[PDB]
Point group: C5
Chain length 311, copies 5
């Protein structure tokens, strides 16, 4: 079987359509997600045309081996998909209606800079490579693009599944390739963020600041250094929840500024003590009492600096 | 091979039956479980009917390629199943008795809000897609739905394996699909919660409260801050046992309220000290002595608030 | 090829035999072990009988496709085995001697209640499903059941590999199945428990008890609370060695009772201090001095309670 | 099919070309990376030559089985690649144009001595083994060597993909092999190095040095030993980011020297105390005051020693 | 195709040869290593003999399916190898020269008692099972046994790859098997052990001993108990580097004895305090001053006891 010969000089249009049955295994670290879907392809091969009256039937069904079928592939997949052909139907004019169910692991890049208020745009790129006998381009049948309502990705909200209708047609290793962009949009979700990461990290930070209602260098050193251990040990506890990136994220910045407020708290505590033992308990107490409004306010305003920086 | 032609206008009934041989690899995080089972299918194709007298035999056995067999598929599977056909038997009337042994990884959503007293309902969804020549619906042979007695899922109690007999018949990409719901019910199980998570976490919390039988700001700061480290380090130790969810669970709420009781204990300790060094040891001692009934009672009642909130 | 017709009304005996070549990958968590072995099957198909004189040969060798061979399967495997047929030999009477080398991942349940003095019984269950034309039962050729001497499972002692000769014959989805139990016994092994888990955990516990040779509430609070952190951090260190079960184990009980001895030590320390600051240093000292024989003795006797409870 | 016979005594040239479609799964620990690419091969087999006029066609397409095709293999792969032949085209002169899409896991050694300013050179080694009837050598078509612009490796910058045009021709197990070196260059990237590993580790180190503005052996011991715990716990937190190597890295040296500055700080603190309690508070204070310029300066200069050692 | 008939009653010699191309993925825990190599086999099948003059060619090449080829297998592999036949060459006399490239995961037992100065002997065991028609033995072609110079195993030194030429011929399940031992000798390598495990663990241990230049029970308790936490937290940090074995290793013994020196340090500190508060500061100071030479010397000598015990 050859590809269908062209009527004029025109290339062959294949009408694509992905319907998401399941989506699962978004690996935030590997920048992958697994998907289980229908792929529908449709084109016109007039070599397969027939008379519905003389053949007796409205629709002819073939096996994949029997007829010509285009080699459609995914670009951004790890390995080629687990495909199973569901149905091949040819109408009287020669219009082939192909359908397969596939499952593929997909590499779409992720951006965690606004964690845990980030949203993502997952791509599924479909290509077809043209042949020597005829050129092939993809098109999108927008009625055959959708998703099951049961489609769930725990800890995200699946907003929308579409495709960009204009395919990207381009030359590669001396032949025309036609690429299509199918986009799954999603938006994050971590109702427990505040009680699982933020609130206990604010509490351990506030505990360090009770050293501004105290003058014991021995109690203060225990307060500030022991709660710094408590902070690091807590960061250890929530390490699994936080994104491990080579760049700075929003939650990551909050964390960093907290390590800074531990450093500045120690400076104060050391200064307050150096002034009191250096017989200036006037200036010593003036600083420690100022820190009690200075630290919380500077914290709140810097957090507004960050918030506004990222959003 | 086409599907069997209909006698009247009726659709084709396939009689389904899943018998669980093994169940294993419930991944609480990925919301999957692996299963190894028999799938039995049964329908009537009168094109395969024969005379037992003239054929000489009572039952004819075919190969899968030889005869028409419906394309049954699972909905909520990662990849299509590892199927091995066990037996195909056709009786004189044309009744096909199909049997295969499969193993599949399955995506059923899990709800840990009532951890570790949660129960689950694992779904295995069977579909069949109807064809142009004839409509197909699934039915359930409830005598062929069951499970091996050896079937174990460590840390759960396998309660029941059934199917919802009314199939869900619906149109999808222009054809009728017939869906079936097979439900594995399970219920959790963790005797170690009481002896592995709750009791040592109550002990480390109680240790923090011995600061209400003390007036040393230096001993008290060590008591409350060191036991807060002990709490976080313990939470680290039992991190593997606890469910890593984007939502708030019951055990997770207990944990959170404990981080709050550390914060409130520090407030008290700081206030008691601020009053004693501010020459009001009457009010200082009044508070610290009140906390000794206040803290434990508030704890017990809040835990009853939580308990009743979740149950 | 059909199954061999019966001489009388008798069912077909297949003579089984597993010889373990390697065993490896015991996953204590997943309750699996991998195995690499020979499976030998032997039955009589008199349709394959021949005259050694007229055929010219002593033994005829066939290909698997050529002759009838029973569908033997494992029950408690994740996926069906990686089988490679080694030899098929038919003697003049029609006795088929089949041999294959397989490797399979196996689900046998494990019991860690007596960790690290537990022993296990790993099952490999062989089934055969009878057919419409004839009934099939398994038998054990005990000369063809054994294990290579190199067979090693690091951290255990491979005691014995046998089979229970009486097969379990039973009806399943309307046909007779014949099941066989092959048992690999194993017994645990951990000299490092004493020098890796128990001894450093007794040392950190004893360190907490030097607070009975002291009256400083500040040193005592540091001793008991700091060593409790040391205990939890050590439990973290040996978390990989200890079994993560939903039930209580023997080592797990020892651990739990140690968390209790930290709680009781804190009670004492708090009471001793409350009596001394409440001007009763007679009773204060009486208790602290009694704890010095009370604690170690109660520990030793409770450990004998536990020991005897589990053994 | 034999290899094409030589015109003269010359060997057969195959023109190679790898175009990277995706690259992913760089395992820093295992020294692997996965890749998905096109491999293009081109040679002249004049046995396949044809007359475009009499054959009627400009280009003949064959199946892999039909014609002779060289066994090209990768050297440094774990398992042989997942190859799928995309197109085989023969022009009138007998020039075969082969194209396949493969995905392979690759073992290229990595050097982390200059972490996190290291750059890498990933190799993909192509071999062909010559045969008895004729010698085979690889050549590089540099226009067919390239990479997709979407090719991403999170936390690195993909600089360049080329091949060394001079193939390495050599005798192995009595035959000529022709090897080619395809090099993917990459350079590291951890913009957050300073902000997540270095800065909080300098802060916890500086906190230890506030013991030079103090004379309390009890506060100083808490300062230096508690911040040493904070250092180790932080190193635990950033363990995932740091490379696990059997050799010394640059970041690893910084870490090591920090453990040394904790040791030397303790020596000082112990000496300062030993002199003050040994009634020499002149020399005691002289040392502690000197450490306040000595420690930071020695640190800065040693870090310049290291920096210059590695770069 | 049957095996070649014997000329006399002699058995068939197959000449083996493994050439290591790559070696990788030594899993210290699972006692496996992956390997990628050439396997060369050579034997005489006179059924394949030909006249070079009449056939026209000097050497005939066959496909694996075409001719008889022995079932050579590995003993100590997890799954049977990923084999790809590279070349089959038959000379005029019937001498088959087979070559395949395989990759296999291999189970060779490892001994870490002298970690990190241990050396290993990795086995690759080749078997052939004799058949009913003829006996088969393996031989070693020592010119076809070697390794690529690029062969690397990070953190080890690949010393040598040979085979024991005398095959082990033996009866198994009623037939002769011929076994061969191919040995890869490797030796460990960890310069970072001294700068990653031993030195910071000696520093944290030395810090505990500054309590012999001090008489404050409160500072001493903080010194010894806080550095014991620091020791456990550090052991946590280097847990990944250290071998997780059921037996006692050399590095493991060093670790254990360090936990003992923490226990003995606490005993001293408790005794020194009990004597000073029990008004015997003569004996109290005598002990503490003796410990300053006793502890370091006993440490050094015990480490020489260990060193000499293991080596």
């Amino acid at each position: 079987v050859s590809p269908p010969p062209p009527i004029a000089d025109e290339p062959l249009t294949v009408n694509t359509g992905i319907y998401l049955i399941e989506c699962y295994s978004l690996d935030d670290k590997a920048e992958t997600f697994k998907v289980n879907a229908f792929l529908s392809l449709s084109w016109k091969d007039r070599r397969l045309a027939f008379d519905p009256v003389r053949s007796g039937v409205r629709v002819k069904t073939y096996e994949p081996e029997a007829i010509w079928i285009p080699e459609i592939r995914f670009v951004n997949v790890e390995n080629a998909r687990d495909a199973d052909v569901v149905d091949i139907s040819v109408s009287p004019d020669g219009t082939v209606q192909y359908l397969e169910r596939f499952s593929a692991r997909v590499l779409s890049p992720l951006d965690f800079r606004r964690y845990p208020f980030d949203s993502q745009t997952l791509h599924i790129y479909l290509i077809v490579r043209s042949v020597d006998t005829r050129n092939i381009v993809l098109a999108v049948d927008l009625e055959k693009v959708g998703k099951n309502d049961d489609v769930f990705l725990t800890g995200w909200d699946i907003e929308s599944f579409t495709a960009v209708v204009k395919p990207a047609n381009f030359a590669l290793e001396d032949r025309l390739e036609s690429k299509l962009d199918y986009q799954l949009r999603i938006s994050r979700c971590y109702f427990s963020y505040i009680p699982n990461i933020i609130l206990p990290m604010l509490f351990i930070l506030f505990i360090s600041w009770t050293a501004f209602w105290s003058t014991s260098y021995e109690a203060n050193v225990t307060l500030v250094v022991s709660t710094l251990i408590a902070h690091i040990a807590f960061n250890i506890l929530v390490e699994t929840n936080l994104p491990k990136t080579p760049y700075m994220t929003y939650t990551g910045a909050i964390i960093f500024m907290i390590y800074l407020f531990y450093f500045v708290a120690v400076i104060e505590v050391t200064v307050q003590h150096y002034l009191k033992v250096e017989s200036q308990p006037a200036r010593a107490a003036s600083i420690t009492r100022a820190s009690r409004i200075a630290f919380p306010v500077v914290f709140l305003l810097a957090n507004i600096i960050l918030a506004f920086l990222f959003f």
